[PDB]
């Protein structure tokens, strides 16, 4: 492939644990181990807003653009929501009695999912005073990642250190199915292929592998090997035929999504990679990753 990758913006900071693109402004949100969150305009290279949220790591953060909010989760057990235009704190509540690993936002209903070291996923309804609408129980270790199926967001996936992915339906108490990944050091990350042509999911593990799954047959389609330490994440790009992964080995890898072979390994020089975002409508094919020593926003093509 000819990826002709370009560095749009990179900056140094404390360890970046969460990262997200705004869908209509050229902004990236980073959430840091130091308790701070930053919003950067990566085209003008100017800091839009930052907040010292807490003294504990902020492990998860997303835009909720349609409400002009960011939502963040931290090791002090709290979910907090801020208006990014005013800095006003909209809500602040204890969500789990343990670390919050991952937050996902429903695209068309006022729902947020949080996944936690307390072994659960919780569904919150912001139009019902941030009510706890449902708790999804069944995992047996830390829930590391939650993601809605973008083609059917009445369902979502959770990836867990118990070596499984569970796929759930809103309003139902048990998984539609449990995938036994064979990733024996656990699942750190799960994501969906975004287009209707493939029923695919992808998982990343401390066992150095990435696996692609057909969620209709439950078969493992491919195993991607090459990373040299824990794989923090792997995602399908929304508009290019590639998969992007990142690792504690300090690299991003770009894999061909047809052949499942590595195309490019990038050492961006920020030590360990922890988190990923892709621009949701594929603007400039932008991707962004957070690392021990800061973040980078890259364009492809």
């Amino acid at each position: 492939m000819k990826l002709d990758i370009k560095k749009t913006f990179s900056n140094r900071s404390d360890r970046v644990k969460g990262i997200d693109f705004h869908p209509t402004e050229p902004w990236v949100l980073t959430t840091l181990y130091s308790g701070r969150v930053e919003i950067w305009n990566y085209e003008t290279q100017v800091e839009v807003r930052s907040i010292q949220v807490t003294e504990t790591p902020v492990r998860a953060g997303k835009f909720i653009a349609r409400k002009n909010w960011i939502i963040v989760g931290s090791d002090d057990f709290r979910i907090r929501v801020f208006n990014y235009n005013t800095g006003e704190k909209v809500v602040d509540f204890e969500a789990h009695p343990d670390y919050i690993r991952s937050i996902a936002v429903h695209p068309t209903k006022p729902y947020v999912l949080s996944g936690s070291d307390d072994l659960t996923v919780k569904l919150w309804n912001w139009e019902n005073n941030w009510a706890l609408e449902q708790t999804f129980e069944g995992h047996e270790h830390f829930v590391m990642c939650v993601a809605f199926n973008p083609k059917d967001p009445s369902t979502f996936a959770s990836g867990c250190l118990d070596r499984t992915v569970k796929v759930w339906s809103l309003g139902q108490s048990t998984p539609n199915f449990t995938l036994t990944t064979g990733q024996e050091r656990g699942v750190n990350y799960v994501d969906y292929y975004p287009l209707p042509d493939k029923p695919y999911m992808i998982t990343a593990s401390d066992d150095l592998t990435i696996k692609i799954w057909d969620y209709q047959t439950k078969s493992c389609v491919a195993t991607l090997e090459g990373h040299m330490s824990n794989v923090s994440f792997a995602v399908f790009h929304p508009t290019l035929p590639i998969i992007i992964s990142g690792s504690e080995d300090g690299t991003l890898k770009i894999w061909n999504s047809s052949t499942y072979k590595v195309e490019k390994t990038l050492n961006v020089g920020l030590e360990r990679s922890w988190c990923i975002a892709t621009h949701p409508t594929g603007r400039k094919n932008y991707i962004a990753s957070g690392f021990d020593n800061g973040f980078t926003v890259l364009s492809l093509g």
């Binding site: 670390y99 070291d117 830390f142 250190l161 401390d206």
Partner: peptide, 6 residues
Amino acid sequence: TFKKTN
């Protein structure tokens, strides 16, 4: 553990 806290 480092896994917990990293």
